[PDB]
Design a protein around this ligand. Structure first.
Ligand SMILES: Cc1cc2c(cc1C)N(C[C@H](O)[C@H](O)[C@H](O)COP(=O)(O)OP(=O)(O)OC[C@H]1O[C@@H](n3cnc4c(N)ncnc43)[C@H](O)[C@@H]1O)c1[nH]c(=O)[nH]c(=O)c1N2
Ligand SMILES: Cc1cc2c(cc1C)N(C[C@H](O)[C@H](O)[C@H](O)COP(=O)(O)OP(=O)(O)OC[C@H]1O[C@@H](n3cnc4c(N)ncnc43)[C@H](O)[C@@H]1O)c1[nH]c(=O)[nH]c(=O)c1N2
Ligand code: PRO
Ligand code: PRO
Ligand code: PRO
Ligand code: PRO
Ligand code: PRO
Ligand code: PRO
Ligand code: PRO
Ligand code: PRO
Lengths: 973, 60, 72, 72, 72, 72
């Protein structure tokens, strides 16, 4: 036997043009080959257009957005499970579209997780909600018609139940009969340990159901089942690789053995690009087990839209050769394109793991198909596509042989493949039906609706009679023509996300083992207090340096900040090491703060040139010029917290510097070493020694600086109480009234209604409340959840919080590092002890020995029971009745804070009513509440959360400056 | 002189009074007050607070 | 609508300039040039803050950022 | 001024815009800082001891006009 | 051209739909007598619709007589 | 629907009646109104057009007499 291949590690995002330079000349097919492709594909499309309806047909017919399609399909599924069809019909006629629009949308969605939530109207009701807006746009009668069509789609193309047992019973064939379709199991991303067991049992149960109804033919002519690795493990991620290999591989092996005993086709689905390498590790370790010898049905899907696709085929082939197995290997284009684009941008990667032009995916798909056909008979390829051109092209390359199959999803490609079977008798195609429980439908529908609603989609275009048949027949190479056109011209690289305004900081893809190992390796390879006299001397020295720095040209100040950003990223490992050792930060938080620090420098520099680089001409009479400028105020005191000891330290300091002020900077007592390094870096980057001084020490040293009569302002990030005493010490002076800029935390809420996806709420609640041990001013402190989904949401958040690893922040697998010091831990433990006697406990995690606090979840009777910002991993939850959203919003107003607010809801009218009502500075809708990006989410709020202006936004720098008008009577000239 | 002083309104070779709204934004610093200048483009913002709305649109 | 109210206030001030000028002279002690000038300045404040008001509070500023996400 | 003080000391107001003497602006500022509620904005214009510099290249009759206007 | 753009099967479907429209919404014949016979109601029953007579722009004297007779 | 909501409503329905030699000329004109983009029946059947769009009253679309003639 040949060698087991090494762990898969292809380059993540190679250059598109170099890939196109090879694929474009090789795509050339001969004239008679291309003519047959043209004929096959024309006949296939003519059959598609012959005219059972589909999802895309419903979307097209009623001009529905994907949100509206989703709402109607959820309503449809609920209505199908009303015991009496006549009861459902009465509902559709008499109630649907008459009113209770948001109630119907909310109840029908709650039904998917809480079957008892829904059991089945004044006139003139304002049409709101997804359904009400649909009614205003189309009329209630069309909405009824659309809902009835969605009911036919949900009943014909999905195999669903309140439990997997009911789904499998509904999808059963008659005893002695084979199932006419394979099972694409619903289920992705276990959030809890209980989730992972349930999906395992569902899969095992489905394997027995399709096994008992499998016929007597050999492979390939036997049913299949499709499974997702993320469903089988609650932290399926590269940084948790060590536990995944120990925990997931036995689970996947157990299911594969159960599949083998029925001689089934067993397929591991392909998921996001940052899980490719981990999935191949798991798949290799499973396939290696000798219990799977003698069975030809094991396999996996490979996504052609990935630049690594061809290397994955090589890896899978060497795997099959090394263990002397036959594998069934599914080639798809890829279901997560939008996710991959967004992720690479957010993560500042140096490129995209996927192609960005559709024709490039189609080109690579045919090249990969040709590669897979040549690997027969060891590899049995399965070409999963509903594109008539792709099918015609793959068929022509096979040159009329067998040993492969096509694949489709129930409700798509039926006319395509029926016609193919008519014209080529030896054609096999496998049809999968989605099978699973209601609690897994929403997550599945969201992704299915993206492909069916995409404008570039082939099935959507082949069904629009506006698109001529010849348009759907252009071969990919003819659309790309030249390799330099491989990348999409309107999609910038992540490093160009803000061009030409400024550069972007670079991130790291943790799902690329080469990138993660280098980062871990680089990082692994890496103070007397001030007397009141030395602080007093620091002010005097900054005061003397003010005049020259103030008069230094803005472009020179900006150049210094941009060089500071350059040095930060060049020395990223040093600062990351400091953030981990001194700050206690996990590697993602440390990398993220380093990026934020560089982003602050570049953004304030760009803002700085705009604001202080030139004068504004004012209109006015002739013979007179009027020019408005802004100039530095004087000496700013900057006081910074320990929880962002580099980025907030540098944001405040470089803002004051950019506006032309000299700065005395007082860092938190707990984190002076990183502040010392940053100041030394700023001096090296071009900030004169006379313009910036560091003073370390106690709160009494911070007080002496802010009481000093010669300072011109204070920029402060910390607690409400210290901000007030600073404000009082400033107002007590007899000198000028100087600006105070303060950000002082929040008691930040999130509102989740029953239309939100519970697994996304859970993800975002876990992140917002427990990332960085809750040591973020933006962190979620108070979750409001509608009662109809509160049980499932609270239980999923608790199960997810239990899977967070707490420990040493330098370990790659850690999710929750220690809290800053013993005094912090003592404050948090006191609030925990108090809440245990005062409110319901849902989760109290196990904390390791040391300066750790584990995630906690408490449920309150009323929001009023939470009266302080508690700066730790401690979530509070209130469940509420949908009619009481006003009591919720008053509860949020009552705290006096207003920093962040999360809103999880499908309902735009609900989201908007919340935004209109609250004053909160940062509102995050259907995502987590943390990690504001400089120049993207200007960060800061009002009330007890501080003064503004927002850091990282366009109103920040001006507050550090004063205005000057120069009026010159020019008439003498 | 302009480079050296911090005064809010500098009038060269004319009188010092009667600032015109939107022409000479009026106001200064030190013991003369806080800013922003009345009748100028930075005035209104000081009476307001900022709000960022971030919507994950990916579901669409 | 707030801006319209300020512009209508400016319209009314100038339309009733004689009344306010008289008030500025009798109650304020202002000479006629100072009163007229302050009346003009009052109307100018209304129209200027109204125009600034539409620019500043009339619409949202879109922030750059990743695809799949809006920031306003 | 006691009624002005009651208004600026009221715990429900969200800011103060003030034009007058330095001394009163400071006491307003102190009454704001003394509150336990939010730190609210104070916008204050408080006068000046305004100078003029005239050198020997200036036209003395234009300096005179402008000094008389600006001071009286 | 319709076939190249939509495919012959869609053209067949469109033609069958046009056949339903022509049969349901038009009262036609090779002569007016056949149209009127096809558009007749049962003896003793009123026609559920009024007649918008086809016919415009006689080009010939024979045309004008034929349209007169059709109308009559 | 009108007859359902207002019982005293009368409407007359016409059918086209005539011979084949008159169909073409009739169809050409009928097809212009059914195929026109501005047509109400064409827009009320396109679900892309929201119901509120079809309800704008004519005066609100013209606003000013100088806009009566079509600008293009
Ligand atoms: C039986 C079966 C099983 C599966 C899958 C399909 C079927 C039929 N899929 C889904 C598959 O990847 C794909 O999303 C859809 O089938 C649509 O692709 P087509 O070839 O049908 O259509 P079509 O040819 O219209 O191609 C659409 C695809 O093109 C790509 N695309 C669109 N715009 C692009 C752009 N600007 N640049 C680059 N590429 C672009 C996307 O991948 C998109 O899905 C999947 N998917 C997956 O990721 N893992 C899996 O395990 C499976 N499993
Ligand atoms: C029973 C019956 C009998 C007849 C007629 C209709 C019916 C139902 N018609 C046809 C009629 O004049 C009209 O053409 C159609 O009925 C469509 O008009 P609506 O009010 O239905 O539709 P709709 O309200 O959509 O209005 C369409 C009409 O608007 C007008 N229009 C479109 N664009 C315009 C523009 N840019 N500027 C100005 N006007 C514009 C045109 O007149 C066009 O027909 C007719 N017609 C006729 O000329 N003589 C006749 O004897 C008859 N007889
Ligand atoms: O999506 C991922 O890759 C990880 C897995 C658990 C939470 N986020
Ligand atoms: O706001 C801050 O940064 C500090 C740290 C814990 C609570 N207050
Ligand atoms: O052992 C581990 O690594 C994980 C972390 C939390 C629960 N188990
Ligand atoms: O957005 C966040 O999570 C942190 C909190 C203060 C600014 N950045
Ligand atoms: O403090 C402020 O807001 C003023 C306005 C422009 C310059 N600084
Ligand atoms: O410029 C002037 O003379 C007056 C004084 C305050 C503002 N306008
Ligand atoms: O009070 C301020 O200065 C902030 C800046 C932008 C809006 N208001
Ligand atoms: O500044 C003012 O308006 C008052 C008048 C005299 C002293 N201070």
């Amino acid at each position: 036997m040949p060698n087991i291949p090494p762990p898969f590690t292809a380059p993540y995002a190679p250059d598109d043009a170099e890939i196109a330079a090879r694929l474009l000349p090789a795509s050339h097919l001969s004239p008679p080959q291309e003519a047959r492709i043209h004929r096959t594909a024309t006949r296939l499309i003519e059959a598609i257009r012959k005219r059972l309806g589909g999802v895309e047909d419903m979307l097209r017919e009623f001009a529905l957005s994907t949100k509206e399609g989703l709402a109607l399909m959820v309503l449809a599924e609920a209505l199908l499970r009303v015991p009496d069809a006549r009861t459902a019909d009465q509902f559709i006629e008499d109630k649907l579209g008459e009113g209770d629009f948001i109630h119907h949308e909310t109840k029908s969605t709650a039904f998917l997780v809480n079957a008892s939530a829904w059991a089945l109207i004044q006139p003139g009701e304002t049409p709101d909600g997804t359904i009400g807006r649909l009614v205003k746009r189309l009329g209630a009668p069309a909405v009824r018609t659309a809902t009835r069509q969605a009911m036919r789609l949900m009943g014909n193309h999905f195999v669903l139940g309140e439990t997997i047992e009911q789904a499998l019973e509904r999808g059963k064939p008659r005893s002695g009969q084979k199932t006419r379709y394979s099972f694409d199991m619903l289920g992705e991303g276990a959030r809890t340990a209980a989730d992972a067991r349930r999906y395992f049992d569902a899969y095992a149960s489905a394997i027995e159901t399709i096994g008992k109804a499998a016929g007597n033919h050999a492979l390939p002519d036997r049913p299949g089942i499709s499974v997702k690795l993320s469903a089988l493990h609650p932290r399926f991620e590269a940084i948790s690789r060590a536990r995944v290999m120990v925990e997931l591989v036995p689970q996947l092996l157990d299911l594969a053995q159960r599949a083998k005993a029925h001689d089934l086709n067993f397929t591991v689905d392909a998921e996001e690009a940052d899980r490719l390498e981990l999935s191949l590790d798991v798949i290799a370790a499973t396939l290696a087990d000798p219990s799977l010898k003698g069975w030809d049905g094991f396999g996996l899907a490979i996504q052609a839209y990935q630049k690594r696709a061809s290397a994955v085929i090589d890896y899978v082939d060497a795997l099959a050769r090394a263990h002397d197995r036959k594998l069934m290997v599914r080639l798809v284009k890829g279901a997560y394109w939008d996710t991959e684009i967004k992720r690479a941008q957010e993560r500042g990667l140096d490129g995209y793991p996927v192609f960005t032009r559709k024709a490039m995916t189609d080109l690579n798909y045919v090249a990969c198909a040709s590669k897979l056909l040549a690997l027969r008979p060891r590899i049995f390829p399965q070409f999963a596509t509903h594109n008539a051109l792709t099918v015609a092209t793959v068929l022509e390359m096979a040159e009329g042989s067998s040993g492969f199959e096509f694949q489709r999803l129930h409700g798509m490609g039926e006319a395509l493949y029926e016609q193919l079977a008519k014209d080529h008798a030896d054609i096999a195609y496998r049809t999968y039906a989605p099978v699973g429980s209601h609690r897994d439908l929403l997550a599945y529908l969201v992704r299915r609706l993206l492909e069916n609603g995409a404008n570039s989609s082939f099935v959507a275009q082949a069904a629009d009679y506006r698109v001529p048949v010849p348009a759907l027949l252009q071969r990919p190479a003819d659309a790309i023509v030249r390799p330099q056109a491989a990348a999409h011209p309107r999609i910038p690289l992540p490093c160009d996300l803000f061009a030409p305004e400024r550069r972007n900081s670079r991130g790291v893809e943790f799902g690329a083992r080469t990138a993660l190992d280098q980062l871990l390796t680089d990082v692994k390879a890496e103070i007397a207090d001030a007397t009141p006299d030395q602080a007093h001397a620091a002010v005097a020295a900054a005061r003397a340096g003010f005049a020259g720095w103030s008069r230094t040209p803005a472009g020179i100040r900006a150049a210094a900040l941009e060089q500071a950003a350059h040095l930060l990223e060049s020395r990223s490992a040093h600062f990351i090491a400091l953030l981990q050792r001194e700050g206690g930060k996990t590697l993602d938080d440390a990398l993220s703060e380093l990026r934020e620090a560089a982003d602050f420098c570049r953004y304030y520099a760009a803002q700085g040139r705009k604001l202080f680089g030139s004068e504004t001409a004012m209109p006015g009479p002739t013979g007179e010029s009027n020019a408005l400028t802004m100039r530095g105020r004087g000496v700013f005191v900057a006081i910074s917290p320990w929880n962002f000891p580099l980025a907030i330290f540098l944001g405040q300091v470089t803002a004051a510097l950019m506006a032309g002020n000299s700065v005395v900077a007082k860092p938190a007592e707990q984190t002076p070493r990183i502040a010392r390094e940053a100041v030394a870096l700023l001096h090296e980057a071009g900030i004169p020694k006379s313009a910036l001084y560091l003073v370390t020490g106690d709160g009494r040293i911070g007080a002496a600086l802010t009481a000093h009569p010669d300072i011109a302002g204070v920029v402060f990030t910390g607690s409400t109480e210290v901000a007030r005493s600073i404000n009082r010490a400033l107002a007590a002076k007899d000198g000028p009234i100087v600006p105070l800029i303060a950000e002082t935390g929040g008691i930040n809420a999130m509102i989740a209604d029953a239309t939100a996806l519970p697994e996304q709420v859970a993800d975002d609640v876990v992140t917002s409340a427990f990332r960085s041990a809750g040591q973020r001013a933006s962190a979620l402190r108070l979750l409001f959840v509608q009662e109809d989904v509160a049980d499932r949401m609270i239980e999923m958040v608790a199960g997810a919080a239990r899977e967070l690893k707490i420990g040493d922040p330098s370990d790659v697998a850690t999710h929750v590092g220690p809290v800053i010091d013993v005094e912090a831990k003592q404050r948090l433990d006191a609030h925990i002890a108090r809440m245990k006697t005062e409110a319901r406990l849902h989760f109290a995690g196990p904390a390791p020995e040391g300066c750790f606090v584990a995630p906690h979840i408490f449920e309150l009777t009323e929001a009023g029971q939470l009266t302080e910002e508690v700066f730790g991993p401690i979530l509070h939850v209130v469940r509420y009745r949908p009619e009481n959203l006003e009591r919720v919003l008053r509860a949020i107003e009552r705290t006096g804070y207003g920093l962040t607010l999360g809103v999880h809801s499908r309902i735009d009218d609900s989201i908007e009513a919340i935004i209109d009502r609250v004053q909160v500075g940062n509102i995050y809708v259907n995502r987590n509440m943390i990690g504001a990006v400089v120049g993207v989410q200007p960060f800061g709020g009002n009330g007890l959360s501080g003064t503004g202006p927002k850091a990282g936004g366009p109103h920040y720098l001006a507050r550090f400056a004063t205005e000057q008008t120069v009026t010159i009577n020019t008439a003498a000239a």
